Symmetry: D3
Subunit: 61 residues, 6 copies
């Protein structure tokens, strides 16, 4: 869907923590602020945004 | 969901083609025959099965 | 070009050795026997063939 | 050669875009400004520079 | 040391399971039967052997 | 152990150089200043710190 979730998240062991995510084809989630893709068809995209929290796992699988 | 789809697929340039896929947490799709995971909680899994076709992209994103 | 070379090669510490390679867009080298690509435009390909020798580095860079 | 090209490029979905590239043994292209390699022989290098455009694919393969 | 351990292990969800491991510079563990390295100095090696069990984590870190 | 070493190091071809490292389960070395891990059990961690030198290879293997 367009709603924000994340399956693989990583955080730094600092306080507050700094965390990020994974891969989608053509577009990133609606909440993403800087999105990076491959110059190809279909393009494989990732979110580069960093927060002090992780989104919840994608509810499907 | 439990239904079979695939976002990143790769095939050999032979006839018939030999193709495979990507990553899920704890479990693989219902149609998967040999599934491999990391000894960790939560475990990150992948399907090793090979077909002569690709499933369609996950309908959500 | 169409000529066979390899930049990143890996071999098993057995006798005779078993060795393979890396990445190209749309097509593999002319000598490649089983070539695998991504269902996308432009497709990113790799050779899965195994020999008991490595090709020489690509002469360009 | 020494001339600047790129096979795998990625860009952020922002305006202007922010883009980067891939892998070479011992040295990066002549136009590269910050180049990073592995402490090994032969060393495997990558360019970390970021532009608002992508170079064209390497003309050979 | 020369003793056999493994930090990152992966297994198939079949019975009995089929499992493997990770990365070392110049040589693999003493128990490894097919070891694969990069044609470079120092070479980065991995074990390709498959068992129906995982070794224990490296005791150091 | 808790002592600082590094097996895979990479540096930029600038003066002074800017260098970093690799992977551990649950914790980073004692000298690490910003450490990033996966939200999972056991978590896989990496050091993001950058210096103008590389640590020496882990003395064990």
């Amino acid at each position: 869907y367009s709603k924000p979730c994340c399956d693989l998240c990583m955080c730094t062991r600092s306080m507050p923590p700094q965390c990020s995510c994974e891969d989608r084809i053509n577009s990133c989630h609606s909440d993403c602020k800087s999105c990076m893709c491959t110059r190809s068809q279909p393009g494989q995209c990732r979110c580069l945004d960093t927060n002090d929290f992780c989104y919840k796992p994608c509810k499907s699988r």
